[model samples]
Target: MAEERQDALREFVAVTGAEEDRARFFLESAGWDLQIALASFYEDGG
Candidate 1:
């Protein structure tokens, strides 16, 4: 998905301070929805 690329992933990384793989997993797992990914990450205490 286009969400896997720089724009979204980079934004996810900057906001979450997550590694590439970690951010990737969360992003993908959340169906490329940054809001859900970010919410899930913080909810998991990441």
Candidate 2:
């Protein structure tokens, strides 16, 4: 499950063109869950 989540994160980063730092910060700041983090980002328009 963790590996799948990480893969999802990688795909999100790729699709969004996020830098390593941005990706790491986003993942960490959002509690390491890519789906939630991305949803929050979209919801917040950030």
Candidate 3:
């Protein structure tokens, strides 16, 4: 699960062009679940 989540996060960052700080902010703000926070990017078409 951890590896899967990590992969998901990596994919999210790659797709969104988000820097580490922005990724961390979103992750922390959204409780560290990549899939959930990814919705925000999807909504914005990032």
Candidate 4:
């Protein structure tokens, strides 16, 4: 999906300090919805 290359994904990684793979997996789990991933990431204590 186009979301794979979203600028926000980069931003997420930047903000959360997640590795590239986890970042993609996080977002991918949310169907590439960065906001949802962000919520889950923080909620899960990432």
Q: List the residue pairs that clash in candidate 3.
A: none
lDDT of 3 by residue, 1-46 (tens): 7655455555657755666557656754776566777787677564
- Taking the tens digit of each residue's C-alpha lDDT, what string does model 1 give over 1-46? 6644656776787787777777877876776567888898789864
- Per-residue error at 44 for model 2, in Å? 3.2
Clashes of each: 0, 0, 0, 0
TM-score of 1: 0.68
Output the lDDT of residue 26, model 1.
80
Ranking by TM-score: 1, 4, 3, 2
Between candidates 1 and 3, name the one with more favorable lDDT.
Answer: 1
Candidate 3 is scored at a TM of: 0.54
- Predicted candidate 2: what Cα RMSD to the true structure? 3.6
Local distance difference test scores for all models: 0.74, 0.64, 0.64, 0.69
Query: In model 2, which runs have C-alpha deviations exceeding 4 angstroms?
Result: 1-11
Clashes of 1: 0
Q: Name the runs in model 4 displaced over 4 angstroms.
A: 1-8
lDDT of 4: 0.69
Model 3 local distance difference test score: 0.64
Q: How accurate is candidate 1 locally (lDDT)?
A: 0.74
lDDT of each residue in 1-46, candidate 2, tens digit only: 7575556566667755566556656865776566776776577575
Please state the error at residue 45 of candidate 3 in Å. Answer: 5.6
